[PDB]
Amino acid sequence: MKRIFEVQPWNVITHTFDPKDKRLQESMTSLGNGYMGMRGDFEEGYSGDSLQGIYLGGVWYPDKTRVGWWKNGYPKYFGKVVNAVNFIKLPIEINGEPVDLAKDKISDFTLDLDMHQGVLNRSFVVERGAVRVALNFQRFLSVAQPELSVQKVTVKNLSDAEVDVTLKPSIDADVMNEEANYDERFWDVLATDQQADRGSIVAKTTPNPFGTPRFTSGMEMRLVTDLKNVAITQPNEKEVTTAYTGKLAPQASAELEKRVIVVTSRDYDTQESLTAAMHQLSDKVAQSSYEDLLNAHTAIWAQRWEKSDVVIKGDDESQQGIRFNLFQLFSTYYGEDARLNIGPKGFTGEKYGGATYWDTEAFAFPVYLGITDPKVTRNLLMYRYKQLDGAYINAQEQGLKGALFPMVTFDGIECHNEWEITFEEIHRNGDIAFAIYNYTRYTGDDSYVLHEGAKVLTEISRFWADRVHFSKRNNQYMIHGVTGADEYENNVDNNWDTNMLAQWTLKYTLEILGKVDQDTAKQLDVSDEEKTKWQDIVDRMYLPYDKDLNIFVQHDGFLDKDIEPVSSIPADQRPINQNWSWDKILRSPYIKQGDVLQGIWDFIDDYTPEQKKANFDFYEPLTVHESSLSPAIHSVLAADLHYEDKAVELYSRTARLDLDNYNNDTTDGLHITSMTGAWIAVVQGFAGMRVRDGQLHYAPFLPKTWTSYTFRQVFRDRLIEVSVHADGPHFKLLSGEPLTIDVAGAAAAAAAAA
Amino acid sequence: MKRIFEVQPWNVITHTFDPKDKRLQESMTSLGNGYMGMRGDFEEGYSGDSLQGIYLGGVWYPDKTRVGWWKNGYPKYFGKVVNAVNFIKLPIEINGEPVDLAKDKISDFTLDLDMHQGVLNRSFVVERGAVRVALNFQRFLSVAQPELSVQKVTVKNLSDAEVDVTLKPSIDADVMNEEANYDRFWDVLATDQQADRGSIVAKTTPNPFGTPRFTSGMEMRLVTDLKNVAITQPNEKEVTTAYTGKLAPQASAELEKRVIVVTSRDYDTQESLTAAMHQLSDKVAQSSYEDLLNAHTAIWAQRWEKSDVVIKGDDESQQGIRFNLFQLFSTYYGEDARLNIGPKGFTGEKYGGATYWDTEAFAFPVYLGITDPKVTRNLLMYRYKQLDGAYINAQEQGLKGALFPMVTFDGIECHNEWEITFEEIHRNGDIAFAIYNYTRYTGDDSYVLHEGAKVLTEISRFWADRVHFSKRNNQYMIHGVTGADEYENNVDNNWDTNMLAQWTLKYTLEILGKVDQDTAKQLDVSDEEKTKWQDIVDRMYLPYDKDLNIFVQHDGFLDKDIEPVSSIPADQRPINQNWSWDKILRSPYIKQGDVLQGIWDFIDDYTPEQKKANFDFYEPLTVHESSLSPAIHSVLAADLHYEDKAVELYSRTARLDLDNYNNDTTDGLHITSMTGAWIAVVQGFAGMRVRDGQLHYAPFLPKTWTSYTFRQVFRDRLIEVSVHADGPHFKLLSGEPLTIDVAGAAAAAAAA
Ligand SMILES: [K+]
Ligand SMILES: [K+]
């Protein structure tokens, strides 16, 4: 829809500043180190339209549920990551007047996100008539020191006369979540400390009646500068500040570094110990130079790129896309904290609350299995196991047995508040179970599924067994009143994907129960009566199908709709979520994202080329891709069917979803969980990567518009590099023991230095 | 739950006062004259738990729509009822201490709602040891002078030794709304206080939605034997008068308080509103209590002459039916075509002031049978006059024609649930049906051939644009809807909905060929449209199952796990209060008539065999979690000769409020719910119906009833139907000779 940044291989940079595209711009320039993250907000302040957003991983608030009308079973709160105390604040005054790009005239603007070093640069000249001052910013959230945020500002007087410049590094707790249900603050300041060269604020989320955890943050600022310190009084009980000034001669420069340490109660047991660590880490960092801190940061990012960069030659728009995805994906989550997960919009916005969704096991798993240690995904599996208690509660809220994993959660308990989604989008249980299988197949490690995983599969199967009903009229089991992955169909009957996933879950669990050891089988305690019941459900599950079209019907009665292609929809009416009333969206034949195709994608090798063709040709043209998680899987499926041009088109739609604002909603933040798309399209799609009966298989094709593409993949303790050129694919074993892979049907042995 | 009033024929009276039942008492003793109304609040004041509620017809206030997640098309705001300036306030001090039933001890208590005269009586003895004082209250909201409220208080000293009494009639604008916290809704524009009278002109505060602000003018005049005393104005928001006197043992005194209430709904300007306030107050000051009361009771007596239902052998039912009609008439009597029937009338505020499809579906049949046709005619013009809002509602969903709202005050939608707001479109058909129902009953073509033709045309245009053609089935269908049975959401081809759409288009086409040249030109319906409409009627898909010989509520309904309601644990009923919404939706349980609602609307267009198959299949799946579901099914049962079943279903309609069935009558009465009993009795028990211009009956007598007699207005005739064990009897009380059909036999009525 709109591309506000230039195209470059390693940078997302622009020389244009427009107040009208501020939120979009802030989203694109977000940063993160897994421990915390934030939007590309201007630290000196900005009075125009903007979304202030800084988020601490795992730090959320239980916002009391807000709905028009209540329904029995609805959750009591919507957990959402808290917009944190503003610790980057650093107003800049020129001759006493603060800089504010919403009002100031500027020249020579540059906003540059350096993806290779993981740093955000921004520079411009403040144009105030005869008074002209250049400002150069650079900052980063250290991947070397998780609690560390580093900012640097360089000032240069371009005027013909002396000018006064004053920087006021500070910490401001007067913040709020724009999406708060009742327009109320979530932070209470516990302690503030202001000195000549330091400042710190210890805050704690306000109390709640839901018995959920309250979080304490400790933020301390330390400085490095050649400016003169000035006395300043603490402005409020919710803000601490310092002041440094300098009378710059023409062409003279000054600079200041702001080092902020951020600690939270999830890593320290008491306010006292938390406060102590805050001070100790600050003392430690004050011993390091800017270069020291930066190099340690860049060295780690360089290492990450070394292991997982995707080099595309001949198409920079595509190069920039894949690198932006992986950059923001890893900035959000790199498996460093086993307690965390991946919020849909990571640390770049508020929508969805940064909570845990089915996005993780459906779309994130494929990528983390491919480029990170298998222990990362194994832990994402345990994350759910550890929340089984909450799943039992969710199911009970709907009068169902077994485990019902939530649509939205932080502790296992449901958070979403829409009956069509909260109670009915149950396919998620199936996606959760599939992730277990996917991890097991990929890694060859069945120690999880034969233990903790068996319990999760058992309880999910228990849910399915209680949720289906037997239709005497059809002598088959059915699943009425649901919402499939395609959220543009609500409260429908026999959503194919859901029935398929339920049947598969039961089938797989029965397989696993036959493999666990006696002690485990005893604990699971699944009677022969249960197994017989489950087997009957597997045997007689109803699956809608249409002979004439040879397709699986999304849900019963789908073909009764007024079927017409997406091409018939006027461009000015798209996206339909922003232009049509909900009833119109629901009854129309338009699909939000993969549903039948999501199922086929999960079980891509279980369907024949003809079946896949029939379903793809029918559904793809009806899909509006209004979920960022839609384009990528469609690209893979297209590649699978040899629709090379369509695959590349879809690749661009996912790889550059945010960069080109495809869904006209990047103003709300980046589609982080969707950042998995480009990699999937390139590897599973273009390269045709599949894991079959324990061995890696590829069958690559090269986008006609490309010279080549190279990527690295982690597979059972081996690190492989795949390079695709016009003359065919090329493989190199970078590490690990000799491995035999399948390439278009030919077995090739890989060995180091050979 | 608990019955707090005695069972009497024409009175809802009790001699017991328990502060615990205060709110319940207040709701039950509400009064109203179609222009204004109020709960049975104690005018002298009460410091205990209570709901202050005085409401002016047509007055409302807007508030921002509130939902969890927004959907394009949702209304921007919703309307609310507003507690008006307190004009009945009249504290009574005995020896300088005001009476307060929340503190004072009393004896010989009486709370009496006289339904025949439309008057509220209350009396008791204030017990304060050596001091004992009797207090007798009487008040009414005149149906002779709509702007008039009349109160009377009689004080009688019963103790030994003289006693001091002081009454302070006043008007207090410092009122609040309970359902809110949003402090004040009224700004005082002008106050006046004299030793002889008082008045307050107030106006609702400004809103950001561009909706109307309302100004009220209230003036009080007195008539008493007590001596006037000079008293200073309490404050900026209240004006008062004071009268005192010393009563010797057994001596008494009285005081009347006449209040005139006018609103900006009837006056172009503030000073014209103020002028009227004074003019009417002068006029009323020329009349005695007896004359004001007599004029009032005379009109109520006339209302009963045309609608009374006398039941012998079931006193509980006798009181219930009378109470239903009384509160209905008190809420609305077709005096102002701009007003309607809110779920709570003038008895409370929680979701009680808007207009629902309920008046067209259930209130209409009742008013048609017991009031002059002019009343229901006004109920029709009400929708015609809000056509503009209907266009907006349709446009909010990208649809053509008119889409009448689910909930409204000004014609624009107020509801905030996509499955109801956007999808429960059967309401459009119900509104079109009301036009037909009225025409068939009255025989008056004037409305349908004019204003009605426009309403039908635009509703037809909505249908023509809302349906879609399914090439696969070569039939038109209507996907993604919610029928009357709200326990099925976003379903496809709800039979009742498709049936109503087809009917609407078919009826409109008939009407178009009959309107005059001016109307035709105004409607401007091309031949292209007419051809299209006919095609829709001709090829409309209607779900049907041959083996069960039933109309299928919606596509796929039979794939549900069909099981009788008897299988639901008794303690889990009502299910909307026990189950999660998803379970309710996928279950085969029905909230209220859906397919049966349509059969009820066209009860003579389906064969006994079709009606039996459909009733027999659906009634056992219906949980009747709607106030009117039992009444509608009672009629269908009676229609099928299921006498016991019809009676059983009827037993829950009449006393919903009197016996507080839902444990929420404390919030107010269920006015729109009070139409069920009459329907079940006359259409059901008596088998009343209009067929091709002729009136018909085929009554049976409930086993426990000795007899029942009801009045009915038809084609300018006043008929009295008396059903006894020896059969039915008829009396033509007024009007020209009329031939009716009684169980197939033609009977000529005369001696009118
Ligand atoms: K749809
Ligand atoms: K249902």
PDB file of C-alpha atoms in Angstrom, chain B residues 119-199:
ATOM      1  CA  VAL B 119     -55.398   5.323  41.147  1.00  0.00           C
ATOM      2  CA  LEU B 120     -52.753   4.562  43.777  1.00  0.00           C
ATOM      3  CA  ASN B 121     -53.888   4.424  47.401  1.00  0.00           C
ATOM      4  CA  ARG B 122     -51.590   4.147  50.415  1.00  0.00           C
ATOM      5  CA  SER B 123     -52.407   4.571  54.099  1.00  0.00           C
ATOM      6  CA  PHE B 124     -51.139   3.635  57.548  1.00  0.00           C
ATOM      7  CA  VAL B 125     -50.735   4.858  61.106  1.00  0.00           C
ATOM      8  CA  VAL B 126     -47.457   6.430  62.188  1.00  0.00           C
ATOM      9  CA  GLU B 127     -46.626   4.847  65.547  1.00  0.00           C
ATOM     10  CA  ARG B 128     -44.524   7.060  67.814  1.00  0.00           C
ATOM     11  CA  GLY B 129     -45.640   6.082  71.306  1.00  0.00           C
ATOM     12  CA  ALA B 130     -47.958   8.702  72.774  1.00  0.00           C
ATOM     13  CA  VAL B 131     -48.246  10.123  69.271  1.00  0.00           C
ATOM     14  CA  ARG B 132     -50.274   8.251  66.672  1.00  0.00           C
ATOM     15  CA  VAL B 133     -51.140   9.839  63.342  1.00  0.00           C
ATOM     16  CA  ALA B 134     -53.034   8.327  60.433  1.00  0.00           C
ATOM     17  CA  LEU B 135     -51.942   9.179  56.893  1.00  0.00           C
ATOM     18  CA  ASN B 136     -54.031   8.506  53.772  1.00  0.00           C
ATOM     19  CA  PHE B 137     -52.534   9.051  50.304  1.00  0.00           C
ATOM     20  CA  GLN B 138     -54.237   9.046  46.904  1.00  0.00           C
ATOM     21  CA  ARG B 139     -52.809  10.049  43.536  1.00  0.00           C
ATOM     22  CA  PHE B 140     -53.186   9.633  39.803  1.00  0.00           C
ATOM     23  CA  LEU B 141     -51.697  10.686  36.477  1.00  0.00           C
ATOM     24  CA  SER B 142     -54.743  11.991  34.628  1.00  0.00           C
ATOM     25  CA  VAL B 143     -55.781  10.439  31.342  1.00  0.00           C
ATOM     26  CA  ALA B 144     -58.155  13.401  30.962  1.00  0.00           C
ATOM     27  CA  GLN B 145     -55.392  16.018  31.259  1.00  0.00           C
ATOM     28  CA  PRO B 146     -52.128  14.217  30.265  1.00  0.00           C
ATOM     29  CA  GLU B 147     -49.854  16.973  31.598  1.00  0.00           C
ATOM     30  CA  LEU B 148     -51.537  16.607  34.993  1.00  0.00           C
ATOM     31  CA  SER B 149     -50.425  14.778  38.123  1.00  0.00           C
ATOM     32  CA  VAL B 150     -52.750  14.919  41.135  1.00  0.00           C
ATOM     33  CA  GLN B 151     -51.830  13.987  44.709  1.00  0.00           C
ATOM     34  CA  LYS B 152     -53.886  14.096  47.900  1.00  0.00           C
ATOM     35  CA  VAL B 153     -52.834  13.544  51.511  1.00  0.00           C
ATOM     36  CA  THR B 154     -55.128  13.342  54.527  1.00  0.00           C
ATOM     37  CA  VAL B 155     -53.729  13.565  58.057  1.00  0.00           C
ATOM     38  CA  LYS B 156     -55.732  12.491  61.111  1.00  0.00           C
ATOM     39  CA  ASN B 157     -54.531  12.763  64.708  1.00  0.00           C
ATOM     40  CA  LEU B 158     -55.344   9.598  66.647  1.00  0.00           C
ATOM     41  CA  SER B 159     -53.347  10.217  69.808  1.00  0.00           C
ATOM     42  CA  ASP B 160     -54.322  11.978  73.014  1.00  0.00           C
ATOM     43  CA  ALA B 161     -53.222  15.615  73.109  1.00  0.00           C
ATOM     44  CA  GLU B 162     -52.770  17.980  70.184  1.00  0.00           C
ATOM     45  CA  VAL B 163     -50.135  17.351  67.509  1.00  0.00           C
ATOM     46  CA  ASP B 164     -48.215  19.526  65.061  1.00  0.00           C
ATOM     47  CA  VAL B 165     -48.129  18.752  61.336  1.00  0.00           C
ATOM     48  CA  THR B 166     -46.170  20.395  58.525  1.00  0.00           C
ATOM     49  CA  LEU B 167     -46.309  19.510  54.815  1.00  0.00           C
ATOM     50  CA  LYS B 168     -43.744  20.898  52.386  1.00  0.00           C
ATOM     51  CA  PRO B 169     -44.936  20.320  48.803  1.00  0.00           C
ATOM     52  CA  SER B 170     -42.016  20.942  46.467  1.00  0.00           C
ATOM     53  CA  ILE B 171     -40.215  20.224  43.209  1.00  0.00           C
ATOM     54  CA  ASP B 172     -36.648  18.933  43.466  1.00  0.00           C
ATOM     55  CA  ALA B 173     -34.354  18.863  40.435  1.00  0.00           C
ATOM     56  CA  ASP B 174     -31.404  17.372  42.276  1.00  0.00           C
ATOM     57  CA  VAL B 175     -32.163  13.881  40.965  1.00  0.00           C
ATOM     58  CA  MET B 176     -29.987  10.976  39.845  1.00  0.00           C
ATOM     59  CA  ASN B 177     -30.064   7.937  37.564  1.00  0.00           C
ATOM     60  CA  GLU B 178     -29.347   4.659  39.312  1.00  0.00           C
ATOM     61  CA  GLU B 179     -28.185   2.630  36.304  1.00  0.00           C
ATOM     62  CA  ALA B 180     -25.444   5.238  35.968  1.00  0.00           C
ATOM     63  CA  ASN B 181     -22.846   7.103  38.007  1.00  0.00           C
ATOM     64  CA  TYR B 182     -22.753   9.967  35.524  1.00  0.00           C
ATOM     65  CA  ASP B 183     -24.017  12.387  38.197  1.00  0.00           C
ATOM     66  CA  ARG B 184     -26.564  14.811  36.707  1.00  0.00           C
ATOM     67  CA  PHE B 185     -28.505  14.811  33.444  1.00  0.00           C
ATOM     68  CA  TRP B 186     -30.578  17.942  34.111  1.00  0.00           C
ATOM     69  CA  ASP B 187     -29.526  21.601  34.153  1.00  0.00           C
ATOM     70  CA  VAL B 188     -31.959  23.952  35.876  1.00  0.00           C
ATOM     71  CA  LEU B 189     -32.899  26.800  33.535  1.00  0.00           C
ATOM     72  CA  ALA B 190     -35.380  28.592  35.786  1.00  0.00           C
ATOM     73  CA  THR B 191     -36.881  28.223  39.245  1.00  0.00           C
ATOM     74  CA  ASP B 192     -39.802  30.087  40.772  1.00  0.00           C
ATOM     75  CA  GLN B 193     -41.070  29.930  44.342  1.00  0.00           C
ATOM     76  CA  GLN B 194     -44.042  31.753  45.791  1.00  0.00           C
ATOM     77  CA  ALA B 195     -46.062  31.086  48.925  1.00  0.00           C
ATOM     78  CA  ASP B 196     -48.806  29.971  46.556  1.00  0.00           C
ATOM     79  CA  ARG B 197     -46.947  27.891  43.981  1.00  0.00           C
ATOM     80  CA  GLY B 198     -43.647  26.827  42.486  1.00  0.00           C
ATOM     81  CA  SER B 199     -42.110  25.788  39.186  1.00  0.00           C
TER      82      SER B 199
END
